[PDB]
Every structure is written in C-alpha cells, then in structure tokens.
Design a protein around this ligand. Structure first.
Ligand code: CL
Ligand code: MG
Ligand code: MG
Ligand code: MG
Ligand code: MG
Lengths: 246, 252
C-alpha cells in the first residue's frame, strides 16, 4: 500500500494521525485561533476556509493562509473549503470553488487541499492534476451529516475517490443507530481488504461514533479529527498510543 | 434493566467494570499473586480455579479462597473454574464441577460464580438456584477459541443464558477475520435491542478484537477483562490503560 508523506509526516504507517480544524471569520480571528492551536499535540492543521467571511477576495484568502503559516511553521497545512451541503458554512459555484483551490495550490502556502468527491468528475481530475503538478497532496472527501449510507455505498464512494486520483480518500457519515457505527467500520474493513492501495480516512460522527476515531487503527483508518469536537487532541493521542502499542 | 451489585460495585450502570484473572497453581502462588494484584486498578477479582493444582481437595480450595479474601479485602470475588472443554487448564466430571461451585457458594467467601452454559441445563438451573439462595451472583459463560458463530447464534446463546437465570450472560469468541470482530459487536447490539433485561458481557479475543474490550458502554457490554501482568485470553491491555480508555469513552 502507498503511504502519503507530507513534509516529514507519514500518513498510512504507525499510529493514526490527528487533524485539527481552524475556524475564523476574519484575519484577526484566524491569527487568534492559530495562536490557540500552536502548542497543541496534532499532526495536520486544517484551515476551514468556508468559515472565512472574505472567501471570494483572493488577496484576503492569501493573507489569511500566510498568517497561519507565520504562526504555525512546523505542521502541514490542509486547505479545506467545506460546502454547506456537506456541513459547511457557505456555498460557492463550482467555478468559484475550483478557482479557490487552484489559487491555494498556486500560493505555495498549503501542503494539501481537500476536494469534494461529487464536485464534478472533470473538475476533480483537472484539480488533482494541478495539485500534483505543484507537489500538493489531495484529500478527496465526502460527508453525510444526516445518515449513514449502506456499507456498499460507502465502499463505492471510497473506490471512486481512488479512481479520481485522491492521495487520501476520506469519508465521514452520521450514525442514527449503534448499527450505523458498525456499518462505517465494516465499510472501512471491506475497502481495506478489497480495494485500498493508499491511506484512507473514515469516521462515524457525533458522540455515538467516537469509537471510530479511537479504535480505528485495526480497521484501517489512517487519520482522524480532534479538538483543541467530539474529543480533545490530548485524549485522542493518549488512546491512539495505547492501541498502537497493544 | 436489572443491575448486579456486588459489595457496592454496580455492574450495568456507568462505565464498564474491569475484571482481572488471578492464576496460581499452589496456595503459595495464590497468595503471592494476590499481593501483587492488591494495588492494581480493577473492580472484580476473578480467581481462575482451573489453574489450581489441588482443586479436588476441598480443604485446599477453601484455604486458597480465604487467602485471597484476607489479602484483597475490598474487591468482589468471582470464582471461575474454566473447563478444559472451554479453554481452561484441566477437566472435572460434571458432578465434580457442580460440587466445586456449590462448595464455593457454601464458603461464604465468594460473591459470584461462573457457570458454563453448555454444562447441562438441569445442572446449570439447579446451581443457579443454589447460588441465588445464598446471595451469590452467577456469570453464565460460553467461549469459542476457534471461531465466531453467526450473530444470530451469539444472540440466541445470550438469550438462553437469561432463560436459565444468569445474572450476567457472558460470551467470548475468536475472530478469524476483522469482520468477525464486528459480528460480535453486532450481536451485542442486537441482544440489547431484542432481549436483554440485565447486564451482558461480550468479547472478541486477539489483538484484532480489542475494540470489544473498550467499547462496552456504546455497544452494550457491562464489563471487560484487563491484564495485571498477563491476561488469560489474547488481546488484552493493562488495567491502567483500560481504565484510561474507558474513562475517555464515558466522558466523551
Ligand atoms: Cl482476558
Ligand atoms: Mg504554477
Ligand atoms: Mg496493533
Ligand atoms: Mg446453605
Ligand atoms: Mg454513558
């Protein structure tokens, strides 16, 4: 299986990695949040660009990315605009979203971008290519904040992400029942044994799904999310380490 | 939902409870292990009587049980003879096994006994009744160290344990695949939805099954085994680490 190396971090070997999400409306908010995260124990900093108020002003986005990089210089930076239809704060047209991610790639300030699987196949392929031409990795993502699809549908979305060239397929789904948490873990196993040839990230959201963040290593999820959220980064790392050494 | 209270420990509320297994061949070993276990963080002391060489000498078994209670004075004591049939160290005839458990009940030294489901229905029912008459709780148990039965079969075994009067149905199975771990968890959930009216304990063994030792609160297992130095079945973690993880899940 491929691993994905981002700076010195190796996703897909050792214990699962920890992603935290920075959310700020203004440049001063982004700076304040970056300062709050600076001493926390995590591996990847995700900037949740959909929270940023001035997302359609190219110079402002560039300034904010730069401000994050000035404060946190030792953690890979993941650029994520999460659409409202997948749990995010706002919607862009397809063209605006693709242009935004290309501008992030161009900046030299980000190590990874998030591309939503269902953006459009032609747009995703072109943007994956563009990212790769600049040595930027792609987390290709899909979220269902309302329900958990059947395991087979989850697997087929992860397989499509690989087809479209994702460096790291990522899916997050909302459990309505305990069985739904198990469905997400089953999909993770099946994807791993049948199709995966690179690291994947899977998560069952909400309080009910938190076991999928903690005890995911055996089943085949290479990273998960903590908070400085359903769980603190310190407590997440504590459990991941215990289970990695079990 | 009935809970099981032993001393003042409540099984079936809050975070899952931690069981450790004490194994000793002689009275001397029983005493030294008990002293070594005294400072460990756990809730229930399981004495694995099948490891004891002198199991057919009533005086010797009674002396060892007393020794455990003298050294570890603040933990519920679970008396478990694990049959060779179900992965234990030695075999007794059915009658000797039943007599051993009745003598444990009679001692006044034990809070719980383990009775294996497949011992025989008449014998199990009689011994459950005897234990209850002396305010001793029964963990009714089943083990498969080779495979994981279908989820519906696991459910039906746990249901049957309820029918026979178990205070706490208990099953431990061995995964052959990662999917089998998830089957054990599925059975746990389904038992909770369809039939449980009391605490149950479920486990998938080996490293692959460790989630099943951690996730009792969300899927429906009321207790879990941890290691002091070494646990009996594959895949355990230390009791300190187990308590750390259980507490994080309880507060999440
Ligand atoms: Cl064990
Ligand atoms: Mg260029
Ligand atoms: Mg391992
Ligand atoms: Mg009597
Ligand atoms: Mg609870």
């Amino acid at each position: 299986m491929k691993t994905v190396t981002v700076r010195d971090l190796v996703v897909g070997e050792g214990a699962p990695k920890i992603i935290v999400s920075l959310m700020g409306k203004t440049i001063t908010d982004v700076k304040s949040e970056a300062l709050a995260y600076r001493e926390a124990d995590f591996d990847i900093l995700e900037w949740r660009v959909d929270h940023f108020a001035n997302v359609t002003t190219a110079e402002s986005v560039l300034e904010a990315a730069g401000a994050i990089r000035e404060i946190i210089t030792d953690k890979p930076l993941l650029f994520t605009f999460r659409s409202a239809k997948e749990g995010g704060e706002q919607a862009l047209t397809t063209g605006q979203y693709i242009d935004l991610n290309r501008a992030a790639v161009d900046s030299g300030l980000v190590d990874m971008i998030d591309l939503e699987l269902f953006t459009g196949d032609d747009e995703v392929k072109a943007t994956v290519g563009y990212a790769h031409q600049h040595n930027v990795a792609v987390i290709m993502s899909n979220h269902d904040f309302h329900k958990t699809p059947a395991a087979e549908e989850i697997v087929q979305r992860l397989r499509k992400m690989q087809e479209l060239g994702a460096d790291i397929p990522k899916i997050a789904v909302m459990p309505q029942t305990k069985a739904d948490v198990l469905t997400l873990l089953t999909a993770t196993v099946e994807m791993q044994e049948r199709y995966a040839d690179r690291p994947i990230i899977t998560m069952s959201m909400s309080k009910t799904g938190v076991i999928s963040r903690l005890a995911g290593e055996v089943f085949g999820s290479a990273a998960t999310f903590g908070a400085v959220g359903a769980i603190s980064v310190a407590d997440l790392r504590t459990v991941l380490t215990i289970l990695h050494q079990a």
